From Swiss-Prot, chain B:
MICAL1 and MICAL2 produce the (R)-S-oxide form. The (R)-S-oxide form is reverted by MSRB1 and MSRB2, which promotes actin repolymerization. Polymerization of globular actin (G-actin) leads to a structural filament (F-actin) in the form of a two-stranded helix. Each actin can bind to 4 others. Interacts with alpha-actinin. Identified in a complex composed of ACTA1, COBL, GSN and TMSB4X. Interacts with TTID. Interacts (via its C-terminus) with USP25. The modification ADP-ribosylarginine is found at residue 162. This is Actin, alpha skeletal muscle. It comes from Oryctolagus cuniculus (Rabbit). InterPro entries: Actin, Actin/actin-like_CS, Actin_CS, ATPase_NBD. Actins are highly conserved proteins that are involved in various types of cell motility and are ubiquitously expressed in all eukaryotic cells. GO terms for molecular function: actin monomer binding; ATP binding; calcium ion binding; calcium-dependent protein binding; cytoskeletal motor activator activity; hydrolase activity; identical protein binding; magnesium ion binding. The gene is ACTA1.
Length: 356, 359
C-alpha cells in the first residue's frame, strides 16, 4: 500500500507517492470559480472567465473551502487515487496555528476519509531530506521565509524566525527595475516572464560592493534574454541586485533583518550547547534559495557574525526546490515511521486534538 | 568517532565517519630508498631517489608490507589519530579473495590494534550512498572498472563483470593522442599535466558519430589550457575521444566490450524478476565516471539494448568521485550498525576467519 505526500505551498502544490524521488504533480495553488470550479494551470488558463483565489498565504491555509478543492483536485485529478485508500502525509508552515492543524486533520478524516495521516513542518522535512535530524534550515518560498532550528528531529519553536519577504517580492522588485529600464511588465502574463528572467539569470554576489564595481566597469556580467515580443533585454547588475534583497531588505523598503541575520539570530536563540551543531549544519531549502552563489555568501556572512573558531557549513542541495516533498517521501517510506501515522481509528476515539 | 578508509588503486580516501567527505586523499604509493619509507605525495616528491610501488592493483592488495605502510601513514600522518582509539571501516574490491580480507583484518588487529573493524565492498557502499540497497553499480576508478548488481543489500558475485580498464588507461591514452596532433607528452611530470587536462576538459559525447563529424568541419569544441611551463595549447576532438574508450575499449587495442554493454549483461546475469529494479536503479561511481554527459550517454545505450517499455534510470550523484567513501561514512555512523563491528575480543576468540561471517 502506497502513502501519499502533499506539500501545500502558497504558490505550488507538490504532490506524489512516498518512495518516489520526486513529486508526480507540481501545480499552482489557485482555485478559480466562475465570475463549479477549476484548480491549477487550467484555472490560470481560464482566468478571464474566473475569479482566482490563493487559499494559502505565507504558508498558512486561510480559505478552507478552496483548500478542499485543491486537495480534491490533488487526489482525483493529479494523482488519480482514492484518498480513502492511502495514508497521507501533509506539510505545514512553521508557526501554524493549532486550530489550523486540527481543521486540516478533521477535513482529511471526515471529508476525504483517509485511513491514516500525519502532518510535518516543511523545514523539518527538508532537514531530513539532507540526511540530518539536527541542524538549522532556511526555507525561502513564495511569500515568506523562515529559519527553523531543529534538534533530534524536532523544530525548536521558540527560536524560529519569520521574514515576510520571499520569491514573490524578488519578482516584484525585478519587475519594477525592468519597468524603469523602459519595458512594461505589470500584467499577469508579463509577471511570469519576469519571474522566468529572475529564475534563469539572477545570482547572489559574494561581495555586493565589488560586484557593483565590476558591473560599472565592464560588460563581463551581462546576460541577454529574448522576450515573447521578440525584443532582447540585457541585464547586468540587475542579476544580483534582485536577490541581494534577501540580505538587504531595505532594497524594497523593509526595515527587517536579512537572511544572514535571521539565521545567526535563530542559532543564538538556541541552547549554547547545540550551537556548534547548528553552525555546521545550515541547510537551505525552497525555490528562493536556488540562486547561484547564495551558499558561499551565507558562509561569508555567518563567518563574520560567529565566533572566530566556529566551523560553519551551508548545505544547499541541487534538489532543494523539492526537498520538503522529498523529506516527506523518505519519512513516509521508513519501516520505523509506520507506527507514527495517526489512524482513522485513533481519530474516531480522540478527535482532531490527536494531531499534536 | 570511527574511521573510514577506502583503499583505492590510485588514491586512498580516508577520514572520519560522519564527515561528508574524506579528510585525506592521497596517492596509493610507497617509495622505499633505491639504494626509511615514504607514502603518498611525499613519495611522489622524492620519486627520483625512491622506488615507487603501487600496493593495490585493480583493487586487490598485492604487497602487504607496503599496505601496512599505507595504513600507518594514513593513521599517524594524514589523519593524525591513534588507531587503537577508533573502530575502522576498510573497503575492498568486488571478488576480493577470501584470504585477502583476512590479512586485512589481521593487520588491523595485530599491528594497529584497533578496537573494532569492518570490511565492505566498494560498489555496495556506493549504492548505500545513493540511499538504496537494490541497484546495479558501475564503479570506474584508477586501475579497474566493475559492474556489480546488488539485491537487498547483497552484491551478486555471479553477475559481476570486471572490465580491465579505467582512469590510468584513459590518462595513458590521452598522452598518446595529444602528442600525435603536435605537442609532446611522454614523461613522469608531463603525466601529471595530462591527467589535469583529462579531469577538466574531457566529456562523453551523446552521439559519437555526430560529434566527430562536428569537430572536423567546425571549431565549436576547442578549449584553451594553460601549461605550468607557461604557454597555451588547444585541445579539440580528443576531449570526448579520450573517455569514449569507456563505451568502446577497442581504442587502446583492448578486446572487451564497453561500459554500456557490461552494464546490460550484468543485469541479464541476474534473476529475471529483479531486472526491473536494477534497470531503474543504475548508480555510477568513481573518478572515471565524472565525465559530463556520461549519464545521458549511458542512458541512451541501455534503453536501446533493454526491452522497449523497461523503466531505466541512471543515477550519477555530483559527489560520485567519493561515493564509496561517503557510503562508508554513512554506514559506520548508523546506530544500527554499531552491533555489527568485529571487535578485538571476537577476533581474539575466533581468528581472522570472523570477517567472512560478520561482514
Ligand atoms: N531557480 C530559481 N531561482 C530563483 N528563484 C526560484 C527558482 N525556482 C523557483 N524560484 C522561486 O521560488 C518561489 C516559489 O518557491 P517555493 O515553490 O519553494 O514556494 P512554495 O513552497 O510554493 O510556497 P511557501 O512559501 O508557502 O513554502 C517563486 O518566487 C519562484 O520564482
Ligand atoms: N573529474 C574527473 N573527470 C574524469 N576523471 C577523473 C576526474 N577526477 C578523477 N578522475 C580519475 O579517476 C581516477 C581515480 O578515481 P578513484 O579514486 O575512484 O580510483 P580508485 O578508487 O583510487 O581506484 P580503484 O577503485 O579502481 O581501485 C583517476 O584516474 C582520475 O584521473
Ligand atoms: Mg514551501
Ligand atoms: Mg506588453
Ligand atoms: Mg575506488
Amino acid at each position: 500500500t502506497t502513502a501519499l505526500v502533499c506539500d501545500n505551498g502558497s504558490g505550488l502544490v507538490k504532490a506524489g507517492f512516498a518512495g518516489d524521488d520526486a513529486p508526480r504533480a507540481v501545480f499552482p495553488s489557485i482555485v478559480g470559480r466562475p465570475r463549479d470550479s477549476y484548480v491549477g494551470d487550467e484555472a490560470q488558463s481560464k482566468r478571464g472567465i474566473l475569479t482566482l483565489k490563493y487559499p494559502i498565504e505565507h504558508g498558512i491555509i486561510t480559505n478552507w473551502d478552496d483548500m478542499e478543492k485543491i486537495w480534491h483536485h490533488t487526489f482525483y485529478n493529479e494523482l488519480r487515487v482514492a484518498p480513502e485508500e492511502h495514508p497521507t502525509l501533509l506539510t505545514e508552515a512553521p508557526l501554524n496555528p493549532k486550530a489550523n492543524r486540527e481543521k486540516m486533520t478533521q477535513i482529511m478524516f471526515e471529508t476525504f476519509n483517509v485511513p491514516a495521516m500525519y502532518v510535518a513542518i516543511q523545514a523539518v522535512l527538508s532537514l531530513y531530506a539532507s540526511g540530518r535530524t539536527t541542524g538549522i534550515v532556511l526555507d525561502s518560498g513564495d511569500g515568506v521565509t523562515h529559519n527553523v532550528p531543529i534538534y533530534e528531529g524536532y523544530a525548536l519553536p521558540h527560536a524560529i524566525m519569520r521574514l515576510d519577504l520571499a520569491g514573490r517580492d524578488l519578482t516584484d522588485y525585478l519587475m519594477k527595475i525592468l519597468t524603469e529600464r523602459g519595458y512594461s511588465f505589470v500584467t499577469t502574463a508579463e509577471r511570469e516572464i519576469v519571474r522566468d528572467i529572475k529564475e534563469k539569470l539572477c545570482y547572489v554576489a559574494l561581495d555586493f560592493e565589488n560586484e557593483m564595481a565590476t558591473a560599472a566597469s565592464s560588460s563581463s556580467l551581462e546576460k541577454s534574454y529574448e522576450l515573447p515580443d521578440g525584443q532582447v533585454i540585457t541585464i547586468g547588475n540587475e542579476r544580483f541586485r534582485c536577490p541581494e534583497t534577501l540580505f538587504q531588505p531595505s532594497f524594497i523598503g523593509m526595515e527587517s533583518a536579512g537572511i544572514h541575520e535571521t539565521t545567526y539570530n535563530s542559532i543564538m536563540k538556541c541552547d549554547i550547547d547545540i550551537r556548534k551543531d547548528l553552525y555546521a549544519n545550515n541547510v537551505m531549502s525552497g525555490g528562493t534559495t536556488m540562486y547561484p552563489g547564495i551558499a558561499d555568501r551565507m558562509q561569508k556572512e555567518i563567518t563574520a557574525l560567529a565566533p572566530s573558531t566556529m566551523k560553519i557549513k551551508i548545505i544547499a542541495p541541487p534538489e532543494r526546490k523539492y526537498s520538503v516533498w522529498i523529506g516527506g517521501s523518505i519519512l513516509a517510506s521508513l519501516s520505523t515511521f509506520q507506527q507514527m501515522w495517526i489512524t482513522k481509528q485513533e481519530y474516531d476515539e480522540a478527535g482532531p486534538s490527536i494531531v499534536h
